Each structure stands twice: as structure tokens, then as C-alpha cells.
């Protein structure tokens, strides 16, 4: 408010302040230098809460332990703010890179994840036989297969990119840990994956839903009559 | 989970699998004893 307070005495002239002409001179100075600090300033508030951190401390602290003089520093009786800034900047980007490429990967599989699943079986409006289904079906289930392989290999390529970014080595106790994180979300990817086509027979094959709806019957059985006993193509067993 | 415990005079081993530390998932090799007496628990590594 002093900052603009000033200006506007310029405007009216009439009078000026004792020893608040050096503040006004440097104060565009002031006006890139907050701007140009904020820059680096946001970037560390959502690079800490970012995290979930316990795989890749020392980078994190070395960042605190960077910074943690600064803020002791900063005096704007004399800004020497031009590289401090940079010098945090030529890291703040490297490690946001390498927060960011992981991030990325995670999304990315979690997409993949949904996209593979669709819908494991679809039915053809009017019924066909036993058999009929299993050629039908054998079609799709190849094409679906498939698309799940080329999803995991994508995924796969993924979890290679995250390494290349945070370059930290595969002994280290930390990415081992990461590394059975992701596995974990592929597992209850592929549980829920495997479900919702589970779920999806279950309608299907439930008597209670197809009666209340108009849905038409599924497979063909075939009667031939036996001597020893009744005789099906599906024989109605196990 | 899905692991095996056999009891013997005074100490129950445990050398069953499919389990791990935080988020990963594997099989057991090794064979893990307690002592019912304090239920002390030492790892026991055959030469074997």
C-alpha cells in the first residue's frame, strides 16, 4: 500500500516523502523479484503435499536442507534473489520432472487398467447353441486378450520411464518397495477387471434378472432320446 | 495368508507362503520358529 501510496503523491506532486524514494526506484524491482520468487514458492508447496516420500527422502530433504538457509537469508535490505532462484530452478524442474513422470506413469496404468476390461462376453440377440457360443465367443476372447497383453505391455514400458526419471538403482530398498506398490494396483486393477466380466455373466445367467426383464433365453440344448437314460449335448451335468 | 503351522514338544514352526512385507506378493523358503514356553520368535536357516 506504501508502494502505491507513493505513486499517486508523484501524480499530485504537491509533496513527496523523506527516504521513500530508494523503496520507489527499486520497487519494480520488488514487483519481479515477489513474482519471480513466487515462481520457485508454489512450485515446493505442491511438490510437498505431492507425495504418499518414504521411497525418495533424500532428495525431498536436500530440497528442505537447500532451502532451509534461504528463508534465514532473505533480508530485502540486499536480494541476491536472480540465482538462489535459479539455482533452486535448475533443480525444482528436475524434481518436479521426476514427481511429474511417475505421476504420469500411475495415471496411465490405472487408464490402461480400464480401458482392458470393456466387457468379456457380448451377447447376439437371438439364441445360437453350446457350440456356436464357444466359436462365437473364442473370436473375441482372442481380440480381448490381446488388448489386455498390449495394455500390460504399455504398462510394462511405463514402470521403465519412472526408473530413467528419478534415476535411483533397482538394489536400493526404496524402489523395490515402489516396485511392489505398482504390482499391487496392476493385481486389484485385474481383480476389478476380472470382476465387473464376472458381474457381467451374473446378470446374464441369474434367473431372477432375465425373468423380470424381456431378455431371451442364451444357449441351445439338443434332446435325443436313450434306451439307459435321457440324453443331452450339454447332458445337464458338471 | 494361506501359510502352514506344525506344532512339536515345546516350539511351533510356520514355513508357509504366499504373503509379504507391505505391498508385495510371493512364496516362502524359509521356516520360521517360536518357543510356546516365552513365544520368542527365531528364524531358523538350514545348511541344507
Same mark, same amino acid.
Given at each position: 500500500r506504501?508502494?502505491?501510496?507513493?505513486?499517486?503523491f508523484?501524480?499530485?506532486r504537491?509533496?513527496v %516523502? *523523506?527516504?521513500?524514494k530508494?523503496?520507489?526506484?527499486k520497487?519494480?524491482?520488488?514487483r *519481479?523479484?515477489?513474482?519471480?520468487?513466487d515462481?520457485?514458492?508454489?512450485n515446493?508447496?505442491?511438490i510437498?503435499?505431492?507425495?504418499?516420500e518414504?521411497?525418495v527422502?533424500?532428495?525431498i530433504?536436500?530440497? $528442505?536442507?537447500?532451502?532451509? %538457509?534461504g528463508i $534465514?537469508?532473505?533480508r530485502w535490505?540486499?536480494?541476491?534473489?536472480?540465482?538462489?532462484?535459479?539455482?533452486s530452478? /535448475?533443480?525444482?524442474d528436475?524434481? &518436479?520432472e *521426476?514427481?511429474?513422470?511417475?505421476?504420469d /506413469?500411475?495415471?496411465?496404468?490405472?487408464k490402461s487398467?480400464a480401458?482392458?476390461?470393456?466387457?468379456?462376453?457380448?451377447r447376439?440377440?437371438?439364441?445360437?447353441?453350446?457350440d456356436?457360443?464357444?466359436q &462365437?465367443?473364442?473370436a473375441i476372447f /482372442?481380440?480381448?486378450?490381446? +488388448?489386455?497383453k498390449?495394455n500390460? !505391455?504399455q504398462? =510394462?514400458?511405463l514402470?521403465? $520411464?519412472?526408473?530413467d526419471?528419478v534415476?535411483? #538403482?533397482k538394489k536400493?530398498?526404496s524402489?523395490?518397495?515402489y !516396485?511392489?506398490?505398482?504390482?499391487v494396483?496392476v493385481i486389484?486393477? +485385474?481383480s476389478?477387471?476380472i470382476?465387473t466380466?464376472?458381474?457381467?455373466?451374473?446378470?446374464?445367467? !441369474?434367473?431372477?434378472?432375465?425373468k423380470?426383464?424381456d431378455? /431371451? %433365453?442364451?444357449?441351445?440344448?439338443?434332446?435325443?432320446?436313450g434306451?439307459?437314460?435321457? =440324453?443331452?449335448?450339454p447332458? +445337464?451335468?458338471? | 495368508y494361506?501359510?502352514?503351522? *506344525?506344532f512339536?514338544?515345546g516350539?511351533?514352526?510356520? &514355513?508357509?507362503?504366499?504373503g509379504?512385507i507391505?505391498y =508385495?506378493?510371493?512364496?516362502?523358503? #524359509?521356516?520360521?520358529v517360536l $518357543?510356546t514356553?516365552?513365544?520368542?520368535?527365531?528364524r531358523?536357516? %538350514?545348511?541344507g
Amino acid at each position: 500500500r506504501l508502494l502505491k501510496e507513493v505513486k499517486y503523491f508523484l501524480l499530485l506532486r504537491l509533496e513527496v %516523502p *523523506t527516504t521513500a524514494k530508494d523503496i520507489y526506484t527499486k520497487a519494480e524491482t520488488y514487483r *519481479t523479484q515477489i513474482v519471480a520468487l513466487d515462481m520457485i514458492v508454489d512450485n515446493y508447496n505442491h511438490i510437498k503435499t505431492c507425495l504418499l516420500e518414504p521411497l525418495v527422502k533424500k532428495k525431498i530433504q536436500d530440497m $528442505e536442507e537447500e532451502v532451509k %538457509p534461504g528463508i $534465514e537469508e532473505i533480508r530485502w535490505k540486499s536480494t541476491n534473489i536472480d540465482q538462489f532462484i535459479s539455482k533452486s530452478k /535448475s533443480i525444482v524442474d528436475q524434481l &518436479f520432472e *521426476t514427481v511429474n513422470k511417475m505421476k504420469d /506413469s500411475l495415471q496411465k496404468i490405472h487408464k490402461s487398467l480400464a480401458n482392458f476390461n470393456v466387457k468379456i462376453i457380448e451377447r447376439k440377440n437371438r439364441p445360437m447353441s453350446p457350440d456356436d457360443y464357444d466359436q &462365437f465367443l473364442k473370436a473375441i476372447f /482372442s481380440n480381448k486378450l490381446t +488388448i489386455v497383453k498390449d495394455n500390460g !505391455n504399455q504398462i =510394462q514400458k511405463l514402470v521403465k $520411464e519412472v526408473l530413467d526419471a528419478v534415476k535411483a #538403482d533397482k538394489k536400493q530398498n526404496s524402489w523395490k518397495n515402489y !516396485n511392489d506398490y505398482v504390482n499391487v494396483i496392476v493385481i486389484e486393477g +485385474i481383480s476389478t477387471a476380472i470382476q465387473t466380466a464376472l458381474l457381467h455373466l451374473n446378470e446374464q445367467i !441369474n434367473p431372477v434378472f432375465i425373468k423380470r426383464n424381456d431378455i /431371451s %433365453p442364451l444357449f441351445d440344448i439338443r434332446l435325443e432320446l436313450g434306451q439307459s437314460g435321457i =440324453q443331452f449335448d450339454p447332458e +445337464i451335468g458338471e | 495368508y494361506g501359510h502352514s503351522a *506344525t506344532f512339536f514338544e515345546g516350539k511351533v514352526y510356520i &514355513f508357509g507362503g504366499h504373503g509379504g512385507i507391505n505391498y =508385495q506378493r510371493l512364496a516362502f523358503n #524359509d521356516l520360521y520358529v517360536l $518357543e510356546t514356553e516365552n513365544f520368542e520368535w527365531t528364524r531358523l536357516e %538350514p545348511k541344507g
